[PDB]
């Protein structure tokens, strides 16, 4: 297959390639994100050192 064979409405989502992306397909089916974003920390503290 090729990119042109995908129906247009399906091109708006992730398109996987078999067997190249089979790991990604498994991740998609598991509904688990491939990258774990670290938890959002607190805003940094600002130190004033006047001149």
């Amino acid at each position: 297959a090729k990119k042109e064979h995908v129906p247009t409405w399906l091109q708006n989502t992730h398109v996987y390639s078999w067997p190249k992306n089979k790991k990604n397909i498994l991740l998609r089916l598991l509904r688990e994100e491939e990258f774990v974003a670290p938890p959002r920390g607190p805003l940094p503290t600002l130190q004033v050192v006047p001149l």
Binding site: P44, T45, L46, Q47, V48, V49, P50, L51
Partner: protein
């Protein structure tokens, strides 16, 4: 001969007003001293 008595020459001398003249004045701005607790620029740093 004629006598200069009546026709004598005249000297001149201005009536100077210097005795009552105002003086030249120098201006100095009173700097807001930094020796006194004047403010400073708040150079900021980030603790990441």
């Amino acid at each position: 001969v004629r006598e200069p008595g009546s026709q004598a020459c005249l000297a001149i001398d201005p009536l100077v007003g210097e005795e009552g003249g105002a003086a030249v004045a120098k201006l100095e701005p009173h700097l807001q001293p930094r020796g006194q607790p004047a403010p400073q620029p708040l150079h900021t740093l980030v603790l990441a």
